[PDB]
Amino acid sequence: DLGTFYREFQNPPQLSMAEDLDSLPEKLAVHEKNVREFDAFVETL
Amino acid sequence: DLGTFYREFQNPPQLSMAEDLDSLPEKLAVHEKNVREFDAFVETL
Amino acid sequence: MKLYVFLVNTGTTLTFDTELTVQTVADLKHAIQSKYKIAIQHQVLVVNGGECMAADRRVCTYSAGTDTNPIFLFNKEMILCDRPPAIPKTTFSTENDMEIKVEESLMMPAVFHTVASRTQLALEMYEVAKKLCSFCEGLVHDEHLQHQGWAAIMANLEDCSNSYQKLLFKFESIYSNYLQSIEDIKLKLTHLGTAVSVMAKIPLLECLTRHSFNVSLLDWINVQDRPNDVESLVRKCFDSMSRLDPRIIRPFIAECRQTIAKLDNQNMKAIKGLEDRLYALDQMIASCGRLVNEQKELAQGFLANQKRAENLKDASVLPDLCLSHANQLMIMLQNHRKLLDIKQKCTTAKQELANNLHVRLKWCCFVMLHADQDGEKLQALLRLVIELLERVKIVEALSTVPQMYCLAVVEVVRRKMFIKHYREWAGALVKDGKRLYEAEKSKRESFGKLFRKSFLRNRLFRGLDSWPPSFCTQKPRKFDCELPDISLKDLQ
Amino acid sequence: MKLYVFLVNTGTTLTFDTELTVQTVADLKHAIQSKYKIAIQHQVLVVNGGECMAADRRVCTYSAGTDTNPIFLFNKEMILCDRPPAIPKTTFSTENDMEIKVEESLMMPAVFHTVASRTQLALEMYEVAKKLCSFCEGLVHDEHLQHQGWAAIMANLEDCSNSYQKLLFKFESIYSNYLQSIEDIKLKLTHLGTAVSVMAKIPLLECLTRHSFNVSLLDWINVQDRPNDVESLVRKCFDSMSRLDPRIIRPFIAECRQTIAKLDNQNMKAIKGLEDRLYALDQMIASCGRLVNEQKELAQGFLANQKRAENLKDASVLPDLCLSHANQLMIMLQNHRKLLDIKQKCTTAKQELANNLHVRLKWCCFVMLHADQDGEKLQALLRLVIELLERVKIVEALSTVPQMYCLAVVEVVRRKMFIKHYREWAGALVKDGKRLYEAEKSKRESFGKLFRKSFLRNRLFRGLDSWPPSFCTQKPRKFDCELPDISLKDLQFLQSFCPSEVQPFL
Amino acid sequence: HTEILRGLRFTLLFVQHVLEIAALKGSASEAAGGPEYQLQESVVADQISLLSREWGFAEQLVLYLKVAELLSSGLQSAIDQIRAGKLCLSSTVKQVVRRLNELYKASVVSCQGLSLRLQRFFLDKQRLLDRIHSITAERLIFSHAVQMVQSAALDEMFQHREGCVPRYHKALLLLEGLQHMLSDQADIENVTKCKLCIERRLSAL
Amino acid sequence: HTEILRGLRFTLLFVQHVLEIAALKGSASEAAGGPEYQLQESVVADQISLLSREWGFAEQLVLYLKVAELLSSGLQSAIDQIRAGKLCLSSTVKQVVRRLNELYKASVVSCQGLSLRLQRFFLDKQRLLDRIHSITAERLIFSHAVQMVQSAALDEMFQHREGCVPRYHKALLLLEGLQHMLSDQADIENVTKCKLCIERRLSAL
């Protein structure tokens, strides 16, 4: 039920950070180099 | 012989004086009266 | 033992094991669901004065599911509907279709069965007639129990309207306080940005050191929780104002908000004219029972009529093979069906009156559904409005920044200054005191240690046997008493 | 195991029963009583190494002695003078009677059986002398234990000589006691003015006498005990000074010299020299017993006579040989005559040694009287010197007290007054501290209710989160709190009114 | 299990949807919803919302990283791929996932640019973030599912009967990757249960 | 004969001896030096035992009082019996008993004449005069007498002088007699040790 749905949750609320995932530029540049395959894409497959 | 004891006899064993002294005059005059009675008996004697 | 009392809600008999008290009320729904199609969310019914029950544990704790508990609830299997039957009596018509002395003797000389007759088949017919009479009695009793359940239902409706009244009192606030909220939340939406700006104006380097570097204090306040916004309270207050539109202010925004005012009250609660008719139904049943008890025997007096026929012993008993000799018993032989139908008349009348009662029950169930699961929405909404008032209060805590930060800085600074000055003066005074302690007291202590045996006994030269108290010569503690690492200058 | 004493001073060695194995030295003197006056008061009873013990000791509390171990008495309680018990044993004239019996009663040689009996009777006499010799050996052991006791007494003497040297230490002390007396009079002379200072005692005091006027609390407490004398006890002091006059040292010195002479011990060692020879005499007596055993072999030889007297079935020579055997045994008994001769000779010399020892023990006890009386007298003099020291010390103590207790009281008074001053000062500062502490607590409550109204201050505030140390705020107690009573200040004022020792009290 | 078949060839669509769940999709309490809402204060509400216009953007950048980390390797694997799904010609089904995959470079670009532009400001946030506990901002997917069920159950009345049921169905479809970020031992299962409740509401919607 | 009066006369001789020791104590002690001694005592010991020694003189006067009282106490029994006549009455100890009574009269007179000024004397630090707790007027000079006997015996056991056991007995056996005054008391047998010494010393005497 919609009442049963609200019973499951009426309105539950939303739930060292400079380095916990700081390696972002690495995979970023990896992808910036890797996009070349799709950039070329001589024939779809 | 006596020196064996003379060793033992080195120093003598010990025993409100003002109050007893103040109270004494009664016993003193009592001694005076008993002496008067004794003189009476002696004259009888 | 199990309840011979049946289920009022269905007005019909059923059974279950007596140890069902440990089974949950939702387990009771499963039991009434294996057949009759109950569900964990089957009806708007509740327990006691319009509230939920502790259904998780044994329903006996909530006095449900017991051995003394037949089925009774909002009765959602049929919307004021049932299949009321009537007494079949064609079997009696068969007996009436052959209402005569049997042909086993076939008009022989009267010595034939001179000590026997059709009394037993007549006895069987009359006893079965009485059986149908008692059957109608039980059926009428079933309809009456159904009426009792309907009364219990009207009572639950009253309890519900009470819950409605409580929710309305909330709604009174969720109107009046909501009307009062027309200013608080707006201001709570109003000044919070200014407070956040003032807080961010002087984000302390001590705050920069707090988690142990610049950062936004209001955001530092905001991000202090992952989902918190430096004007989360302001946003929620303005949103509540938006949700405070006049259609919500309607006297039945939740249609219940006036449905309870009008239908479940205000002379529209027909339950006032309910119970007596149920009593009138019980009276009709009792009168029917008075008419129908022992009546088949009253017509078919075979026990005496047997000897009556024996005394008769007509020399011309040929016409006596018909109903003329069998008088009132023969009358019963065709009147059993009539009595059965007469009983069925009041029985089906009770069934249809119960249908009408369930009809008015659904009539009230209109405003019921308007409240249960429709105005209950407004109920949780008012709970939310209360949460919004709390959010406004928190917004004030955000407003508490503009003076709170300056007060904390000034008080901490002045307190640290006073603490330093006082601790320093305390140490200096304790030092002067220890200096005195040495110079006089320790010198005297040495002279007295020498004065061991200065007189032949202690009391002889009694005096200055000790130094002064010497307390308060130790050093003071640390200034500000080990405060948190927030540096006042870093606050400055 | 335990055994009885040698009765050393005379020497009557004997053993005892099992009870003595743990029976106390008191039980030892009890056994001494048990068959003699040996319970009487006595010089010493001692063991090997020298006990001179006392009744309190258990058996093991003293060192052991036995029928083979040394423990005995060497005291006047038996034979305070010389008392040589004579030869308990029988004389040997029966052998001289037997000498006749062999010489003549061997007649009628045809009675070989009677002749053998005579030889057997001669052999009887042999074994008899054997016993005699054993007794001689007893006398030997007697001389042994005799020298033993002599040495034990010597040990005592050395212990006395040790006590002598103790007296000598006293003498060095006594001369020092004489030496220390040089200023002791001046110390007593000063004690005169000291008792003068005791007079005009502190005219007031803390609580006057405080119950624990012309009755000087000085002199009062100088009477604070039963049997002693106040103001240095000079009536006893000059008396003991006499009790330690130089003349006493001279008589004491002479006593010491005599004690040294009391240990001259020339007779003891010289007796041993003879005893050393007398020990060789014991050796000779042992040889005498050897010859005795030789006589036994003769009896063994004599036994052969009675043997061959039977079932021989031979010529008359066997009867004649017995006559020849009679002469052989006769010469044997002649050797035996010389034997018993030297035997009784040894016994005599033994008694003589006992007598020399009697003289010894006499002189020994004399020292154990002359010295020991003088010795305990010296011990007394020693305690007297200890007194001559301690009493003088106490006198000087009270002398200082005429300064000491007075100055102590004056100091206590000044300290108590300044202590009241400082207590007032410290309490006033403590009150100011309490005031500032109240100020801090007020800031705490005000700005904490404000902090209860602040903005999420848990992370957003600090510093005033608590307050500085208000601990140590209760005002101080009284400096010199438990002081003796304040009339000590009146005593300080009165110091001038009693100026007998004014400077020191000030 | 259709990793080389349609069940995963369409998974790029779910990935793109989860991306959209943040892309131009910053939620806020200032949302009006319902039959209507008074706009007399909506201006201040949007003001409170947009006072952190780039902060939610940075949270979104963090969330998009959860898919972009795998998208980098997907770009790496765009060459020399193997699949055997049937009912297709010239690897058109392969193209079905690869066309969406073709935007993975721009996906990294946006996962960066949602916070990259104000780098100097990000330093202060990093200065905050330095001792600030990290937060995988992708958890807002569970918040989206909760808000979906909440709308479906308790929005102002007079809406239609369908009730945006497909929105809650898409929320239920989060199990295709919304749990890529960091959480507790079973917080992903909790978000999935929220999705199940939202799907129940969609069936009720 | 050998009656209560005779026992009283014996104890009266003892009391007279103790009173003579007291008389020496009455600022009259002397002749204790004996052999050549520390003659410097002429001023030193004089001041030491005289300058403030009135406590002993007072003890002696109170002792005279005690002697008179004891004579009266013995008389109140002995004379009562003699008039009653339970004894032999074969002897003439009555005049001697009368002489002892007159001696008691004189002793009481001495005690009173002393008390005439001893009142103000005790007034000097009267509270101090109190708190004596245990006390015994006999012991007050008995200690001095025992000390004198000790000096004599020091001369004796070292032969620095000669005398008799009775020389010490004059006080020790004085205490031995009238033992009820030292019977059933804390310091009972006040001169038992000196008496035991004199028992042996009788032979040398």
Author numbering:
A (entry chain E), B (entry chain F): 462 to 476, 487 to 516
C (entry chain A): 1 to 212, 304 to 583
D (entry chain B): 1 to 212, 304 to 597
E (entry chain C), F (entry chain D): 840 to 1044
Paper text:
ULK1C and PI3KC3-C1 were mixed and visualized by cryo-EM ([Fig figs6]). The presence of the ULK1^MIT^-ATG13^MIM^ heterodimer was confirmed on both of the FIP200 shoulders, demonstrating that the stoichiometry of the ULK1 complex is altered by the presence of PI3KC3-C1. The presence of PI3KC3-C1 induces a rearrangement of ULK1C from a FIP200:ATG13:ULK1 2:1:1 to a 2:2:2 stoichiometry by dislocating an ATG13 loop (ATG13^MR^) from an inhibitory site on the dimeric FIP200 scaffold. This suggests a mechanism for the initiation of autophagy through PI3KC3-C1-induced dimerization of ULK1 as bound to FIP200, followed by an activating trans-autophosphorylation of ULK1. The presence of an excess of 2:2:2 ULK1C cores relative to ULK1C: PI3KC3-C1 supercomplexes suggests that PI3KC3-C1 acts as an exchange factor to promote the 2:2:2 complex, serving to displace ATG13 from the autoinhibitory site #2. This model suggests that PI3KC3-C1 does not need to remain tightly bound in a supercomplex to ULK1C following activation, but PI3KC3-C1 would be susceptible to phosphorylation by ULK1 ^.
The unc-51-like kinase protein kinase complex (ULK1C) and the class III phosphatidylinositol (PI) 3-kinase complex I (PI3KC3-C1) are the most upstream and central players in the initiation of macroautophagy. FIP200 is the central scaffolding subunit of the ULK1 complex (ULK1C), which also contains the ULK1 (or ULK2) kinase itself, ATG13, and ATG101. PI3KC3-C1 contains one copy each of the lipid kinase VPS34, the pseudokinase VPS15, and the regulatory subunits BECN1 and ATG14. The two complexes coassemble through extensive contacts between the FIP200 scaffold subunit of ULK1C and the VPS15 pseudokinase subunit of PI3KC3-C1.
